[PDB]
Design an enzyme around this catalytic site. Structure first.
Site, mmCIF file in Angstrom:
data_model
loop_
_atom_site.group_PDB
_atom_site.id
_atom_site.type_symbol
_atom_site.label_atom_id
_atom_site.label_comp_id
_atom_site.label_asym_id
_atom_site.label_seq_id
_atom_site.Cartn_x
_atom_site.Cartn_y
_atom_site.Cartn_z
ATOM 1 N N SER A 96 1.079 -0.773 -0.022
ATOM 2 C CA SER A 96 0.276 0.103 0.196
ATOM 3 C C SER A 96 0.605 1.361 0.219
ATOM 4 O O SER A 96 0.211 2.581 -0.623
ATOM 5 C CB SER A 96 -0.980 -0.028 1.047
ATOM 6 O OG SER A 96 -0.617 0.509 1.921
ATOM 7 N N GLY A 114 -0.746 6.387 -2.309
ATOM 8 C CA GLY A 114 -1.561 7.268 -3.481
ATOM 9 C C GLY A 114 -2.762 6.641 -4.885
ATOM 10 O O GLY A 114 -2.850 7.111 -5.020
ATOM 11 N N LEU A 115 -2.395 5.231 -4.645
ATOM 12 C CA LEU A 115 -2.583 4.451 -5.474
ATOM 13 C C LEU A 115 -4.485 4.342 -4.994
ATOM 14 O O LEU A 115 -5.374 4.596 -5.487
ATOM 15 C CB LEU A 115 -2.441 2.377 -5.620
ATOM 16 C CG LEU A 115 -3.375 2.310 -6.551
ATOM 17 C CD1 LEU A 115 -3.121 2.915 -7.821
ATOM 18 C CD2 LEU A 115 -1.976 0.805 -6.756
ATOM 19 N N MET A 173 4.440 -3.497 5.169
ATOM 20 C CA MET A 173 5.984 -3.958 5.660
ATOM 21 C C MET A 173 6.704 -3.589 6.557
ATOM 22 O O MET A 173 6.722 -3.622 7.439
ATOM 23 C CB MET A 173 6.855 -4.534 5.316
ATOM 24 C CG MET A 173 7.443 -6.014 5.364
ATOM 25 S SD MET A 173 7.896 -7.320 4.993
ATOM 26 C CE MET A 173 9.083 -8.271 6.338
ATOM 27 N N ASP A 190 4.560 -8.396 6.638
ATOM 28 C CA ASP A 190 4.885 -9.153 5.532
ATOM 29 C C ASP A 190 3.706 -9.278 4.893
ATOM 30 O O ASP A 190 3.249 -10.893 5.507
ATOM 31 C CB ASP A 190 6.076 -10.142 5.468
ATOM 32 C CG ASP A 190 6.347 -11.008 4.457
ATOM 33 O OD1 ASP A 190 7.388 -11.495 3.976
ATOM 34 O OD2 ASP A 190 5.436 -10.801 3.383
ATOM 35 N N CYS A 196 9.139 -4.695 -7.226
ATOM 36 C CA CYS A 196 10.430 -5.941 -8.439
ATOM 37 C C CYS A 196 11.945 -5.425 -8.348
ATOM 38 O O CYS A 196 12.327 -5.395 -8.924
ATOM 39 C CB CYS A 196 9.805 -6.148 -9.505
ATOM 40 S SG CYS A 196 10.453 -7.376 -10.422
#
Ligand SMILES: Nc1ncnc2c1ncn2[C@@H]1O[C@H](CSCC[C@H](N)C(=O)O)[C@@H](O)[C@H]1O
Ligand SMILES: [Zn+2]
Ligand SMILES: [Zn+2]
EC number: 2.1.1.37
Length: 824
Positions: A373, A377-378, A396, A417, A453
């Site tokens: 999260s 912003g999203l 996390m 996590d 990623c």
């Protein structure tokens, strides 16, 4: 090959040129419309050709034919070699073939989504329709055969027709012909109806303004300088956004004629030109404070080709409005307004002519789980779009999680996590150790997140261990969430190069996974700058929709942005993929500059740390009015900046305020620092064989490698105002342009990073005027954060939160597209 081919039963229908049959006998084998067939490729390297037989007929030339609606093999999609060998995909490719080419009947099964899809956590099959231009996998059409077409029914054909029909110009209503021209009151193109009195978008070059504009007097070469005092100035060796749309109100519509009939390929529109403020003599410096959607009426007329019309827009006279300019404005897309006319001749703003005047379903919000999260912003962009309510968040890192709570009192935030949380739900636990209720199947309708990623950067081919690394990665975990919760909608956001990591194998495996689950899905790259933020930020976006839904489209660009920063296409195994985005150059709104972004912010000093200070002023920009609100709000939050070392503090003070200034403007001087230390002079004791001597007869190399040789170990020089390492490797890195660079008021932020460093990759992080790096708040403004948006932790924590976020205006744009999928 087929030799013994004879029809069976009475013809289904007899056209003039074709006689259709329902069954044919091929080498003693029954064949029926609806059956699937294989054909052997001439090119032994190509996958076997596979088709559904949609029709059977005989041609006048004695040929016994079928219509072949081809399937697409997995390896011919983005999936490539990741795809199930036995999976086929639908495509809009079909053609007429000789029955005698058939190699064999094949069995093709439609693997439909189970009726209990939400609870799911040697023969060919298919589930999706593949769009190869946009890389969209989507549910097959629901369209059924009618009695009239049951003999030839071909989804591919029907689709191509619908496209053509939608694509093409058509006149809805003719008025009268006048001098070899039919005048019309109504036309249409690409699903949009344009009537007289409607306003239209047009390319910048559709027409010209009648105002005279003197070419900017600009300036000759800048003042010359002493090159011993400014030894790197020479490395500066060697306004790029297009214009937004022209806008016009339709006055007349007329087209030519063919065979006594309307020539629809020759529709022309006569328009009243609208002026944007920056189109008047006011230019830009005269329009800093105006609404991005305010225009000026004009009686100037232009003739334009319908073909050039880029879309329809609403333009209303302010006074005829039933609501407030603000309410009207934020009410819908493509909404403009005016309150005055502009006389190109007297450069004066009159009242609008009389003829310029007029004639005198609540959607459920998706329950959303936001994994990774961040500060939200999203989730904020989505909230703004009105499509979602994030009920659950997983982060996390404590500070970011806290930040999320600050902004979302209503969502249960698990600071944990994601891997262990998922195990907890798998463990049947109703609750984590803190009494917090875990989300379960059915709770989650929308799943979104930006999984870091991290590895995978070395874009060499996927090996065996690599596949293991991926199977244990956070993007896979995110996919695990999707698989378990089976949400209606799925959004994975990431860095642009998500699409290219490890030869695009990361992208391919996650699409493969989504397909395996039975999800509709697609991918694309977007540029945040094009959605109303003053920053270059290309991001990857993977969309997915559950079987019963519509797959969302990528949002059309709203603001014009520097073309070089709008390379949105991605190549996978040499195949170029683009998204559905149609606005490939211009757009409705002018670009958002650094000025719009932070011209109102009070002055602060290097190291400023007071997280609550008052705005000592009003919004100056449209952008600042949006972000600060109309609401009463006196407190400016997080207008603080990092405390750079005395050395770095000194370097900053010495970067000139001229637009474009960076490290190459630094003077080679000794400075007594704010510690008692010394910034020394950098010394040049090597020839730069490539760059030569300077005008002061000085050498230009700071290491032996400047002379072609290997590096002298002793070379490095310390505590020097001009960073040694920059001339050291300047040649091999385009002179490190931007490092220690000031933002330009007219320009835009480089990609907003977790930790802005003058000497970082993109180091143009100095305020345009003040002697410091940009503030946490300023960075938040470069993203699309409202001023009320809260962050949490020490200054670096907040920068991290801001640099990590998805700009809410980008998220909002995506949100509205998903919103389209919620109608009906
Ligand atoms: N294993 C893990 N479980 C949960 N969150 C993790 C994680 N590993 C990293 N993260 C968090 O995932 C976040 C990705 S940044 C994404 C932020 C968000 N999309 C926004 O718009 O603000 C980081 O804040 C990081 O702390
Ligand atoms: Zn067809
Ligand atoms: Zn060297």
């Amino acid at each position: 090959s087929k030799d013994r081919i004879s029809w069976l039963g009475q013809p289904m229908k007899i056209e003039e040129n074709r006689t259709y049959y329902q069954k044919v006998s091929i080498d003693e084998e029954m064949l029926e419309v609806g059956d699937c067939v294989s054909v052997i490729p001439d090119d032994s390297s190509k996958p076997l050709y596979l088709a559904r037989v949609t029709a059977l007929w005989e041609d006048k030339n004695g040929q016994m034919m079928f219509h072949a609606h081809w399937f697409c093999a997995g390896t011919d999609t983005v999936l490539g070699a990741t795809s199930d060998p036995l999976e086929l995909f639908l495509v809009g490719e079909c053609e007429n073939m000789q029955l005698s080419y058939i190699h064999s009947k094949v069995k093709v099964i439609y693997k439909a989504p189970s009726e209990n899809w939400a609870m799911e956590g040697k023969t060919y099959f298919f589930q999706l329709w593949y769009n190869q231009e946009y890389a969209r996998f989507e549910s097959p059409p629901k369209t059924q055969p009618t009695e009239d077409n049951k003999h030839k029914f071909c989804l591919s054909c029907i689709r191509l027709a619908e496209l053509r029909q939608k694509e093409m110009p058509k006149v809805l209503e003719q008025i009268e012909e006048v001098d070899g021209r039919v005048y019309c009151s109504s036309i249409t193109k690409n699903g949009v109806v344009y009537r007289l009195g409607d306003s239209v978008y047009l390319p910048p070059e559709a027409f010209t303004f009648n105002i005279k504009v003197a070419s900017p007097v600009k300036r000759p070469k800048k003042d010359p300088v002493n090159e011993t005092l400014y030894p790197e100035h020479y490395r500066k060796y060697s306004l790029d956004a297009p214009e937004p749309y022209r806008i016009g109100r339709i006055k007349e519509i007329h087209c030519g004629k063919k065979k006594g009939k309307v020539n629809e390929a020759d529709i022309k529109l006569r328009l009243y030109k609208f002026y944007r403020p920056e189109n008047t003599h006011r230019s830009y410096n005269g329009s800093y404070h105006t609404d991005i959607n305010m225009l000026y009426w004009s009686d100037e007329e232009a003739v334009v080709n319908f073909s050039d019309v880029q879309g329809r827009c609403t333009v209303e006279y302010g006074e005829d409005l039933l609501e407030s300019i603000q309410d009207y404005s934020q009410g819908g897309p493509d909404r403009f307004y005016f309150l005055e006319a502009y006389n190109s001749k007297t450069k004066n703003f009159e009242d609008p002519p009389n003829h310029a005047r007029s004639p005198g379903i609540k959607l459920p919000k998706l329950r959303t789980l936001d994994v990774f999260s961040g500060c939200g912003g999203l989730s904020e962009g989505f909230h703004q779009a009105g499509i979602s309510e994030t009920l659950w968040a997983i982060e996390m890192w404590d500070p970011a999680a806290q930040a999320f709570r600050l902004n979302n009192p209503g969502t249960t935030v698990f600071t944990e996590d994601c891997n262990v949380l998922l195990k907890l739900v798998m463990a049947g636990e109703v609750t984590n150790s803190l009494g917090q209720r875990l989300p379960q199947k059915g709770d989650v309708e929308m799943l979104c997140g930006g999984p870091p990623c991290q590895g995978f950067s070395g874009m060499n081919r996927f090996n065996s261990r690599t596949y293991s690394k991926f199977k244990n990665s956070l993007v896979v975990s995110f996919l695990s969430y999707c698989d378990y919760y089976r949400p209606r909608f799925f959004l994975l956001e990431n860095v642009r190069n998500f699409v290219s990591y490890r030869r695009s194998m990361v992208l391919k495996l996650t699409l493969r996974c989504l397909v395996r689950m039975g999800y509709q899905c697609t991918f694309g790259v977007l540029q945040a700058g094009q959605y109303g933020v003053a920053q270059t930020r290309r991001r990857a976006i993977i969309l997915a929709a559950a079987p019963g839904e519509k797959l969302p489209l990528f949002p059309e660009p709203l603001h014009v942005f520097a073309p070089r920063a709008c390379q949105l296409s991605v190549v996978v195994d040499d195949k170029k993929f683009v998204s559905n985005i149609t606005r490939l150059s211009s757009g409705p709104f002018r670009t958002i500059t650094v000025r719009d972004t932070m011209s109102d912010l009070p002055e602060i000093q290097n190291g400023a740390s007071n997280s609550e200070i008052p705005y000592n002023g009003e919004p100056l920009s449209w952008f600042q009015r949006q972000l600060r609100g109309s609401h009463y709000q006196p407190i400016l939050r997080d207008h603080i900046c990092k405390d750079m070392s005395p050395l770095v503090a000194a370097r900053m003070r010495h970067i000139p305020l001229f637009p474009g200034s960076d490290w190459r403007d630094l003077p080679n001087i000794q400075v007594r620092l704010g510690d008692g230390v010394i910034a020394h002079k950098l010394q040049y004791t090597f020839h730069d064989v490539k760059n030569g001597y300077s005008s002061t007869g000085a050498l230009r190399g700071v290491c032996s490698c400047a002379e072609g040789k290997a590096c002298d170990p002793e070379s490095r020089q310390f505590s020097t105002l001009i960073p040694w390492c920059l001339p050291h490797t300047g040649n091999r890195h385009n002179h490190w342009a931007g490092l220690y660079g000031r933002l330009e008021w007219d320009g835009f932020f480089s990609t907003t990073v977790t930790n802005p460093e003058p000497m970082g990759k993109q180091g143009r992080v100095l305020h345009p005027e003040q002697h410091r790096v940009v503030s946490v708040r300023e960075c938040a403004r470069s993203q699309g954060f409202p001023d009320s948006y809260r962050f949490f932790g020490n200054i670096l924590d907040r920068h991290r939160q801001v640099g990590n976020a998805v700009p809410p205006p980008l998220a909002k744009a995506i949100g509205l597209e998903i919103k389209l999928c919620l109608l009906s």
